[PDB]
Symmetry: D2
Subunit: 467 residues, 4 copies
């Protein structure tokens, strides 16, 4: 009902032209955005709505059946050209927004789709210039959230001195939000999985994020950060919080993020003896990009110690998870594209089936195909007592569209908080400093393989049983 | 490899010609019996193998493809005519076995398919004359096992003074042996269902055995015993033992029957305030037998207070099942054929889903259409935290063939023991004495219904939350 | 070192001269305060240090041995005469504080011991002038913290707009801090009482606070608040939070108050059917004040429905405490002085001792005679299996001295938080509004009795088994 | 009434005159024996009541006050001289017993206090001649119950072919029967110790039986058996059964021995890698027998590897005790006399006390100075959250008198059964056969020390945390 404005900061950027504009396109096409919604593209380069349309339509996946809808979408679009650290551009932007249908009363939604080196300046100018005095104001902040505990604290302190937590929306591109809700309903609305969700029954927790592609083209951008900062400290650790949390007081966003930050407070700093780092190398038997390793990219500096694979074992030190390993295994250039939560349960206390029993498993897969199945054992049909391992299944805008829909709706549950981010960086900062100080050489693994075998050895050591 | 003999006592009886000969037919046809197996029918009236063929073939369900195999099977059988209480006849039958290929060294298997009023004489004569000195001897005792604690005690004392527990096989026609193994493997090989199998999680247990037909023709025989002795005293109580048993020390038959009798030893005597007794009456809407009531059968004595339906709540007072109701609901002429084990779980402690969750259920249906499925809630596809109830499935000679194969193989796990049988009557004897002493009037219910609503009121009172 | 200043707001009040001067005197006498500490009294009446001496010496309970040390303590005292709502008075008080040894660098602590209506002006004036620019500043706020959710929210919002939670110290005079630490260590450092601290084992929780004396003198002031607001809203509910809290992430003050707030957030509003209200009436026999009832006090308004006793059942609707009653029983003019936490455990699952077992209890008595004892069953010596009830013991400035020491050391664990207080008032606000709207008549009970019988009936109804 | 006869088989032996006659003295002196109790000594040497008096009075420990009652006890006694393998002597004994006041109607109770090589003939002669046709018959059998599985099965099969389990009373001199009942009431009547009695909480179980003296003169008798067959196979393993048993269906003896044998069936055979065997050596610094080693005894054969100390770790592979070690530590000539049960509990999940908490323990000391106490952490009084470990106590004929009283009363709970003994010998037979075949050398330890250090290393290896 209320009129809204979708503000794309740095709309000329690659991310804005490939993932955000198509994602508001698909959201307006499906009728999910509020009826009165305006898109204002703001960047440094002087462009028009026609230029943005021309440069973004290939990624729109447009069809001839909806050219009228496409024209309606682009009639709601607007562009303002200005520097990110020049105030005059910001009051020009604010005057443009006020020069709209109920622009002053409109709810303003900022998306910061620009390099993080200017987040300070952009947030400083937005607070003084482009706020709305009637409707709410919300900024979407993209990763990276700094690289250390100190930098993350300084950016978070700046933003929280300007905004409040109700206005900060730190987005996580890899959070499905549907399998997360499946997790919460499964382990919180069912008594089957309630009492068994603790130390006494679960042996280990494996949180996986594999990508079959390396760092083609954009290897220099990945070099400065590494796979830990890329995936593990934010996405896999948020999945750890969702898996290991206590039952919240309610399904409110704050009541869930409190449980997540409480789980984070129980995790101690990472020790390097529980970390296996890998770096993919070219495959001689490959066909395309498989024949080029991480160091083969001309944008990667020579002798780069950046790891494209990492397996890290964490321990949530509370009553429910003390001593249970949490193996965060993520890496690039692996054999498949997988992202799942895997729980191995303990062997049954007292075996009457002559060591034929296997550990029960509960897998919550997000990528490529969503599934929730339990690998438990049922009796093999016949005339004889032996269990057999059987896979039993227990289970549409994608993750990004629904995340933007949460930002519109104000559901901040699936976004990392400030204290949550501080604990997430506290867990990993000493290990990252040690890695970037000593520069230990990562274990090379072949492109398309399963990663270094030392990661498998570490998983064996911590108490993981693989068939 | 070793030769076997299958002795059918009372082969001229209805039970033999209707259930036994087809069952051994299906066991021999499927190539499951030992190759050297002899069948020796014995009854009072003078018959031959040809007479048995003429009276039995329509119930064989044979096909023209296997008429040669049928001829081979009937060239293997034999008949002996003699009284059940004459030593000379038993000596003749023993000689008849001795006049067979390796007959003296054969394993002898006696099935008691004759009225229980003469078991006292028949077992005595069998022990006196027909016993085997080399091969094992096994007798299969058909229900009824007496009418109360005293009659069952005297019969069991006689049989155990003659034979040992390794030789007694008290058969349960309604026991699947397929879903029982599924139960044991499900709850004993899986940690998913291990910790939750107790008071803290399971709210109530429903053990159901319904039949869509009444007591046509043979209602007079049912009159003297009633539905309690007919189904509930033995079959439903064995199912209760299998559900409530502790994990045995091994998969041995004795190690399982010890747990069964231990479970029976902690069930108090049945009180009349936990029992709902009903009698099916005609459904004037008719259709067939439905328009004839229990008392409308001329074979039933006038003014018969025999209950064709019974709902009884039992409490296994031990550390695992204290306070958890065990509702045995069995009846005749009900709405459908069903035999299932249903476990309601408690509501989740602390509801963050606005009273939308329902009690989880684990259902182990024995017949028809064997299945093991849990009613647990998944996330409703959509946009919000909405739980919806979903049925998730977790799952070949019939039961009688697999039970006769148990007697052949010596597996005595699914047969009731003497101490187990004595505990079964100590739980039901006071109630039955009260019923046939005071002679209460059962609540009449229409043919084809779900039973008297007083049973539903009883289940609701004891803690069964029916949605 | 690090010189301190202890500013006692309201130096002429009864609370000051009767409890605060003795407490700080005992703190210095025991050598517990920092060596450099100054006590600056401030009130409206023109007084001196000698007037403070003459008005407060009866209550120091001093001895002639330490009269020199008493003189030393009074040599560190001072008085400032100024109105509570005069800016010049606070300016001269700030100048007086600066006119001390290392005064500007001193840590300032203001004890607000003045009537509730004046906090609004006093906090504002203190924040305007009397703040310290170098050392820390802390305020100690005496109850009442408003009369309902609205008044408490107003006062808390004012104070939080002025001060931060690190500076607000809401004092609870009834909180032992010695048996509370014993409770936390007992239930968090021991595996004996760890697993059993949940629904599955605990039947009901009784939190008790009884006084043997009535409302002599201070009767009209008690009239406007009632026993609920006086004791149950703050002290008994904090005891409930301590009993029902999960294990905090650490022993830090914030980590404990977070668990306390999470416990409070899981408690629904109090219903009038779970409340029993009593009002003590004069015991005809008596000896003294027992002859005088609540309305017999001339200062109590006629026809007062104020309850001097209250029994309230609370339910913490979370995973650990769903369905477990929390019976808060507080009252005045009862049979004995008592303040204890009593935990009844369930009956043992399966009784093999012929119903001779009583429910196990864990009692943590705070006053009188601080003790921790559990009532479990031990075998009666002899030749028989006859268990018998046995009491087994499981277990220094007073509570107020250690509470002021907490404010000096900054240990804010034992002080209620703004959100904690908001939740506490949210729980009780509808019930109190109904009480002072409908004006129910409390059940009159004899002075020196155990309270109205309806409280015992309520405990019996909710599941309390009294031997 | 119901006249009783106490037959001491082999009354001329050391065991009778040193332990049994004083025990019946103390039983009749305290008025615990039935009033019509006759004592009949029977052995080879031609003796009289006066001679038994002369040889046994020094061990009677009587007083001149009760010297009058002494004759009354000796006025009920009688003696028969006969060989143990002569039917004429046993017929004479039967006639002598029949030549008593209501001797034919009397209850006959035989004590077998004669060498085990003669038991086979003695039991046969008793069953042939001396059995009672009216009252009950009970035989008390002394250890050893054979040397291994084969001999024990032979003896038990012989006795069971002669007598039934209601007549066989296998005595255990070291079973207190007083602290065992305390343990049962503690863990079965209380929920404080109920849910914590499993894998999830208990880390290890230590079963101790120490003696400060070595083989004094009877080293030759101990040489053929060893400390395993001496104490560990029978007494410590019965303690293991009592600790690890599930809650019986009742307090009946049969229901308890059923659980004991069920626990025994869940114990795998002992492996030599979980066994530490020791042999004590003389201590130069000693004064008396401490200076003489095991091999220094002339009655001990030269080059004897008989173990006088043994530390053995067992595992009860069932649902409640999977992976929990059961360390049986017994030895002779140790530092102190002790026989206790110690249960170490796991570390609390999540330490908020900075690695200060120690594992909770529950100690049930049987001898000396019977006591039950828990070592659990309570807060150290002061100004800090630091717990301290404290010992909190949870707590008359001696053990042998109460055991004979159990035999008289028919309480068979504390006597080992046939199948119990079968499982007990099955557990230890492979290890003992390996010991007697390979003949390993035990680790020498100093007389009066704590035992070999390898035992401590084994306890630390299996999971025992020593402070």
């Amino acid at each position: 009902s209320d009129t809204h404005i979708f503000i794309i900061m740095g709309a000329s950027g690659d991310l804005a032209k490939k993932k955000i504009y198509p994602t508001i396109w698909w959201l307006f096409r499906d009728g999910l955005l509020p009826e009165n919604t305006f898109i204002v593209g703001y960047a440094r380069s002087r462009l028009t709505v026609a230029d943005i349309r021309k440069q973004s339509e290939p990624f729109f996946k447009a069809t001839p059946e909806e050219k009228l809808k496409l024209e309606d979408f682009f009639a709601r679009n607007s562009y303002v050209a200005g520097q990110y650290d020049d105030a005059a551009s910001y009051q020009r932007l604010n005057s443009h927004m006020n020069a709209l249908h109920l622009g002053s009363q409109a709810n303003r939604l900022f998306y910061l789709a620009l390099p993080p080196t200017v987040y300070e300046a952009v947030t400083k100018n937005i607070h003084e210039s482009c706020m709305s005095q009637i409707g709410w104001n919300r900024i979407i902040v993209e990763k990276p959230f700094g690289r250390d505990l100190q930098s993350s604290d300084r950016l978070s302190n700046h933003i929280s001195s300007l905004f409040r937590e109700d206005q900060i929306y730190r987005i996580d591109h890899y959070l499905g939000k549907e399998m997360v809700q499946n997790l919460m309903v499964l382990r919180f609305a069912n008594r089957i999985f309630g009492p068994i969700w603790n130390r006494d029954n679960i042996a280990c927790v494996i949180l996986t994020f594999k990508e079959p592609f390396g760092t083609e083209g954009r290897g220099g951008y990945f070099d400065e950060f590494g796979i830990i900062r890329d995936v593990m400290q934010n996405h896999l650790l948020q999945m750890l919080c969702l898996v290991a949390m206590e039952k919240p007081a309610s399904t409110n966003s704050d009541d869930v993020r409190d449980e997540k930050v409480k789980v984070l407070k129980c995790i101690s700093e990472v020790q390097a003896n529980n970390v296996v780092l890998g770096q993919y190398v070219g495959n001689p038997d490959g066909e395309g990009e498989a024949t080029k390793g991480y160091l083969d990219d001309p944008t990667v500096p020579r002798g780069s110690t950046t790891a494209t694979f990492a397996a890290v074992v964490l321990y949530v030190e509370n009553e429910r998870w003390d001593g249970v390993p949490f193996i965060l295994r993520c890496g690039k250039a692996l054999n498949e594209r997988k992202a799942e939560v895997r729980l191995q349960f303990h062997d049954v206390a007292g075996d009457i089936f002559h060591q034929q029993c296997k550990r029960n498993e509960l897998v919550i897969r997000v990528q490529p195909n969503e599934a929730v199945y339990t690998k438990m054992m049922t009796k093999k049909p016949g005339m004889f007592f032996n269990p057999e391992e059987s896979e039993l299944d227990l289970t549409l805008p994608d993750a990004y569209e629904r995340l933007i829909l949460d930002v519109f709706c104000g559901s901040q549950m699936h976004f990392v908080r400030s204290d949550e981010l501080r604990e997430a960086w506290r867990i990993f900062t000493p290990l990252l400093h040690q890695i970037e100080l000593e520069k230990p050489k990562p274990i090379p693994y072949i492109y398309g393989s399963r990663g270094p075998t030392e990661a498998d050895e570490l998983m064996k050591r911590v108490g993981f049983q693989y068939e």
